[PDB]
Structures are given as C-alpha cells and as structure tokens.
C-alpha cells in the first residue's frame, strides 16, 4: 500500500494502548492480534477488535503523509513506540508485505496482513442518542459492574443493562443472587429503551473513560452500542437476549430501616468474614433497637462476633447473608452513611447511600 506517516511518539502511545484493549493476547486468528492502520485526509486511524467489540483512535497528521492502510502486530508495534525515547519522531511506510518503522538510529521491519482482510463492525444505524460527562458514565458502570454474572449459562446476565427513561440513564447488573442499579439524570429527554452490553465491552468502556467532565456521546442501535469521547470511538455488539424484569425484584414495602457509618459497617463485616466458611461465606445479622450484631463461624468452629451501634427502630430480627455480596456493596458505595432496608428473614435487603437514592443494591439472604 501507499501508506506513509511520521508521528511523534507521545501522539501514538495512548491511542495504541486504547485500541489494543480488546486484544486478549492469544488471538484465534493472526489478524485479530493486529491493529488496522488507515491514513486518509490528515488523519491516522487505528483499530483493534475481538469481533465482538472494537476500539478506534483518530490521530491528526501534521507532518507529510500518504494515504493507505495495513494491519500490524499490536503488541510489537506498541512496544516499539513505547521503547523509543521521549519525543522521538516515528516514520512509518510500507515495503511490500512489510511495514518499516524508523526513528533516530532504530529500524524495524514488521510483518503485515492486508487491510482488506480486517473485520468491520461499524455498519449499523443509531436509534437512541445522548451525551453525558464521561465521569457520569464511569460512575454508572463502577457502581454496578461487580454484580454482573461471570460465565453464567443464562448468558444475558453476563453483561449490563443500559436503560433510558425520561431524562435518566440507568445501569443494572445481576447474577441472580444480588443486583445493582444506578441512575443518573442527563438533562435530555430520552425514549424508553434498554439494551444489554456484554461484560467485556462494559469493562473496556469503563477503561476508556477517566474522571473528567469531557462529553461522551452514546449511540444505541438495534444490535450495537457506540461511545465517542475525545478522539476515541468504542463500539460493541449488544447481547441478543432478554434481561430480567428487575423492577419486580426490588422490595416493595420495607418496614425496617437501619442506618450506620459505612466505614464502621464495612470494617465489621470484613473482620467477621475472616471466620466465615471459605466457600459459602455466610454471616448472621442480628438487629434490635439501635444495635447490630454480626456473627460468623466456619467448619473449624472458629467464631467472630461484632457489635455496632446503629440507628434502628424496627422489630428484632435475624437474617443471613453471603458476606462477600455485602462487602461488594459497601466497597462500591463511596459515602459516609449507609441505609439498609429490610422486611423479613426470607426477603431481600436493599442497601443505599443514606443521603442519595441514585444507586440501590438488592441482596438476597441465605438460609442460615
């Protein structure tokens, strides 16, 4: 091909790292371990894919260039760019089936595969679109991603529901035992819609975002989702399955409300966990007037007991939980005080920030 460009090292490093995200180190096809490079107009585009999702980075070209395209080994090309000195100018051109990279006194010949052979996952139509700060989208995903299933046979749980309603975007994740839901207003009237994003795409989207306020433009199609921020475009196939009707698993009228400091509660559960059964992780909670007692024991008959002062006025009650599910929630909440809402020993608990309803966690108890 005719492709030629010269780009400064630091304009390539983060693009190469981002578009290499979808690559898993042991590709099934050799071209899947490659990045597609394309020069057109004054832009270099870099694309990496795993057939389910793809990451694209755009790089403006201010130095002389020639259009064309090829695919190049991702790890090797990234490692070469990163290994060159700070401020190095990286000149790239094609010589037959080889890509020549030259910088200073360094020269590299990499094997290529034709750009016409690279997969394409961009040919679809947007049906819902909106913009939001990337920090808001990062929060939505972090608040809930830990509750996604891993390799469940119910494949539609191995992912995250993204749901639009009114002016809100909501994420939902569940593994059938616990659920997380987080809702954020984005100030745009949206149609009622929901799609499932596969877990690997969710994780990769999260990793493409930082905590800035820079706008992220989201487009949702019939079978794909696309997120554009800065000079990066993430696209993922959607999961073709039906998500559970999560609104019907939220406790309807919890008559018992407990509030406690998040750190004290988390630390108490974390210590009790040490003496819980390593496989089933069950702990007992005893609630009574302004007091919570947590106990744990394990097959060796070791036992932990924690007592905490809390604000609680409901009836006395004992209920069992998988302590890892509880600690996941308390680690996900980044707040000072937590509210726990209960009904009885066989019904789920709902856990929230005591001062905010934007996130809610529903954990089903254990017989214990």
């Amino acid at each position: 091909s005719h492709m030629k460009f010269t780009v400064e090292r630091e304009h390539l490093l983060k693009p190469l790292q981002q578009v290499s995200g979808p690559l898993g180190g042991r590709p099934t096809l050799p071209i899947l371990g490659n990045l597609l490079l394309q020069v057109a107009d004054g832009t270099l585009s870099l694309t990496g894919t795993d057939l389910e999702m793809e990451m694209v980075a755009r790089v403006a070209l201010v130095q002389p260039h020639e259009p064309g395209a090829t695919t190049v080994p991702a790890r090797k090309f990234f490692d070469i760019c990163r290994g060159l000195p700070e401020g190095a100018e990286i000149a790239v051109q094609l010589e037959g089936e080889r890509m020549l990279v030259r910088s200073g006194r360094s020269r590299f010949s990499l094997s290529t595969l034709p750009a016409a052979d690279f997969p394409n996952l961009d040919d679809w139509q947007s049906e819902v679109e909106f913009t939001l700060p990337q920090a808001t989208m990062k929060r939505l995903i972090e608040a809930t991603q830990f509750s996604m299933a891993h390799q469940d046979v119910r494949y539609y749980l191995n992912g995250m529901l993204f749901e639009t309603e009114g002016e809100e975007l909501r994420t939902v994740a569940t593994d059938g035992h616990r659920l997380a839901v987080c809702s954020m207003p984005i100030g745009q009237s949206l149609p009622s819609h929901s799609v499932i994003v596969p877990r690997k795409g969710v994780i990769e989207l999260m990793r493409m975002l930082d905590g800035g306020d820079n706008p992220l433009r989201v487009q949702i199609g019939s079978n794909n989702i696309r997120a554009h921020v800065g000079d990066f475009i993430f696209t993922s196939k959607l999961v073709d399955g039906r998500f559970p009707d999560y609104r019907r698993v939220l406790p309807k009228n919890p008559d018992k409300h407990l509030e406690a400091g998040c750190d004290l509660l988390k630390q108490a559960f974390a210590r009790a966990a040490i003496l819980s059964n390593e496989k089933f992780r069950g702990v007992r909670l005893y609630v009574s007037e302004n007091q919570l007692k947590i106990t744990a024991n394990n097959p060796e008959q070791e036992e932990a007991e924690e007592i905490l002062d809390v604000t609680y006025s409901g009836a006395e009650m004992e209920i069992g939980f998988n302590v890892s599910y509880v600690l996941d929630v308390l680690n996900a909440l980044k707040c000072e005080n937590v509210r726990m809402m209960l009904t009885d020993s066989v019904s789920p608990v709902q856990i929230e920030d005591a001062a905010s309803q934007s996130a809610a966690y529903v954990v089903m108890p254990m017989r214990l």
Binding site: G176, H177, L179, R248, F280, V346, M366
Partner: peptide, 5 residues
C-alpha cells in the same frame, strides 16, 4: 443462598 428470580 436464596434466588432473587
């Protein structure tokens, strides 16, 4: 462990 659904 009990089921949510």
């Amino acid at each position: 462990q009990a089921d949510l659904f």
